[PDB]
Amino acid sequence: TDDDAEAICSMCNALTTAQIVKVLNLYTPVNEFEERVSVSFIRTIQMR
Amino acid sequence: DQLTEEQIAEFKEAFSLFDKDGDGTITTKQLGTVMRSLGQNPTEAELQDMINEVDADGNGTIDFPQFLTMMARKMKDTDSEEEIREAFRVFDKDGNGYISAAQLRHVMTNLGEKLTDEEVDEMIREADIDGDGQVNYEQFVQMMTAK
Amino acid sequence: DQLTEEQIAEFKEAFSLFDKDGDGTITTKQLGTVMRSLGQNPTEAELQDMINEVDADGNGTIDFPQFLTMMARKMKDTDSEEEIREAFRVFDKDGNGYISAAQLRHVMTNLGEKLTDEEVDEMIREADIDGDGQVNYEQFVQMMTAK
Structure with a gap:
């Protein structure tokens, strides 16, 4: 959710934006229940 | 099936525990x-199964004898605590018998039937x-399924 | 904990007050x-337990010496106003410092023993x-203090 995006933006003080987008995009669902990050989330993080 | 008189009295007592109507x-x-307050655990999909079987009339409130019959069928097949212990030890990876609280909370919230975060926190x-x-x-499983 | 002579005399006075026979x-x-009026509050289950212990076999109707004996074996020191307060807080489903009248009447009528409606309204x-x-x-506990 976008609320998750805002909470992320709150806790991303130290890391640079490029590092943040890299780490969030390169996450992969190791197990079945979790689900892959959606492109809209990347966009929201980038513009935020 | 066979249902003891004390069991029937307890079923009557539970039949209107929250009958505010x-x-x-x-x-x-x-x-x-x-059922969950009565000590036996019905699956939510199974719970919907009973609801669909009984609510064919559309009344919305289960009749007492039908509830007793399905409860007798529930006590016909009782889940073993050792099965839950095996599942928990399977979930743990290190084999130390200890599992991270955050990991278990995440597993409960995400996989399968969602559990409200307040339920897990409690x-x-x-x-x-x-x-x-x-x-x-192991200790938590024992205390919860003390039976 | 055997009863003292003064407490025995007061108990006999109460017996006479209730000696309708x-x-x-x-x-x-x-x-x-x-038992209930004396200040000690043994549950209806507890009251039945002591009744079955005596069995009404010594004298048919319970006499004063048997009352003293059962007191000697059934001192009730568990009564405590703070225990009443915590039990009331647990009983409060809402937890907002107020126990609903509907909730308490429904519980008294159904949950545990069946309680008459006139008493509940009382x-x-x-x-x-x-x-x-x-x-x-809270105010309920403050007059529970005299109870």
């Missing part, structure tokens, strides 16, 4: 709550589980 | 009324919060 017949909405709060330090699942 | 013995219902009236439909637990 005053009808005297518990609704299917809290029916699963009734589960840790009651079971003296520590978030930072992994807590043995 | 007038022969120095009282019935099981009268004996339970004595408690709701004596709480003096009958109009609101939700009795404050």
